[PDB]
Design a protein around this ligand. Sequence first.
Ligand SMILES: Cc1cc2nc3c(=O)[nH]c(=O)nc-3n(C[C@H](O)[C@H](O)[C@H](O)COP(=O)(O)OP(=O)(O)OC[C@H]3O[C@@H](n4cnc5c(N)ncnc54)[C@H](O)[C@@H]3O)c2cc1C
Ligand SMILES: [Cl-]
Ligand SMILES: [Cl-]
Length: 381
Amino acid sequence: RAPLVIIGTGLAGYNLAREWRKLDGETPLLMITADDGRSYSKPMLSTGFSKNKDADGLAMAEPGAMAEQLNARILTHTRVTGIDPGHQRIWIGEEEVRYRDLVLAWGAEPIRVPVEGDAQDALYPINDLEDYARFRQAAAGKRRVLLLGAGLIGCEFANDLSSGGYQLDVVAPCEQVMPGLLHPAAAKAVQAGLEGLGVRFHLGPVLASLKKAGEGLEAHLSDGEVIPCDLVVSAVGLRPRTELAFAAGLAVNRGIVVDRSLRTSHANIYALGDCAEVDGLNLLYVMPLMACARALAQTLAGNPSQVAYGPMPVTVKTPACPLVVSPPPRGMDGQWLVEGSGTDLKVLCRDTAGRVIGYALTGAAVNEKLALNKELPGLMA
Ligand SMILES: Cc1cc2nc3c(=O)[nH]c(=O)nc-3n(C[C@H](O)[C@H](O)[C@H](O)COP(=O)(O)OP(=O)(O)OC[C@H]3O[C@@H](n4cnc5c(N)ncnc54)[C@H](O)[C@@H]3O)c2cc1C
Ligand SMILES: [Cl-]
Ligand SMILES: [Cl-]
């Protein structure tokens, strides 16, 4: 009778539900989500123009069909407002839900920045299917887009928006695209690719003030640049949602702290996907999420199981300069060598044995991904 309760109907929630329903078709299942509950592949948000798709074109199933497929009750546009571990329950406003076990699959939030001016609140985040719909409707008939951020998400959107016919300015105070992810030579190759589409980068400044001007906006940068635009996309980065777990007394660090079996610090509470920090690893992509869904499904069905991440390369969706990057496993390093030329770069990290432990591949060099993957150590030992 007491139900499995899953907070979140993104890829983590729905893949855990599906993998677990292969093992247990009789226990009640309750999923809760603050959005509309549609099943969609979030990575596809940044290909909407290049694929000629709107938000509906990206959805794979509606919540009712999902509830039927998973033999679940799914609560939509429903916001969980607290967790009460000592009583095996969660709060929604002034209502409680009791659980057999609780799964935190509630993802990451956009990183905000300080902005002044009368239009300071006219920033569009794009972090789910509803954000996207709302952005697509506002972008209809428009031409000039200012984008904040120069990470993976900002670059993919910059490339995609451009291919959609938009004029792009990218603003970020960091000194290169994808800092922390990319070797500088590789970063330089990717930036040149995007600039070749007409994207203009403003690296160093931040947005100081956003103001209504005539029938659009003027973006006042900290360096005195003032760039006219129709809309502003805020894509600085993402941070796991941890506030509610902290208040409830669960260990949090960058994400919710879980072991390789996805268990939080408290009995009967687990976590996975973007919100989870799994044995030190908070990995904001699908490959690890899927590994976690397979193992936790087992554990929730009485077969205690742990993940053991193998190599998980990141493919960055920038057709202007294709990119695959596989950072070396943490607490492991070697010499970085840049090979190739112009914008077709193969950057390899070799350990003291001479083995390739990480790489960054741009342009034509991405064709080497499948060969080089055979060299890689797993992300966990
Ligand atoms: C534009 C972009 C491009 C990407 N491209 C790739 C790619 O090419 N390859 C790749 O591997 N990864 C990619 N990713 C990363 C990948 O999409 C994410 O890692 C993955 O979607 C995370 O899934 P999730 O279910 O953990 O989180 P989310 O999809 O964010 O889901 C969180 C869920 O929790 C719900 N929720 C949150 N708070 C509450 C609350 N308090 N109460 C009730 N419900 C709540 C939300 O409604 C949502 O259903 C991309 C991400 C972005 C945004
Ligand atoms: Cl990012
Ligand atoms: Cl941060």
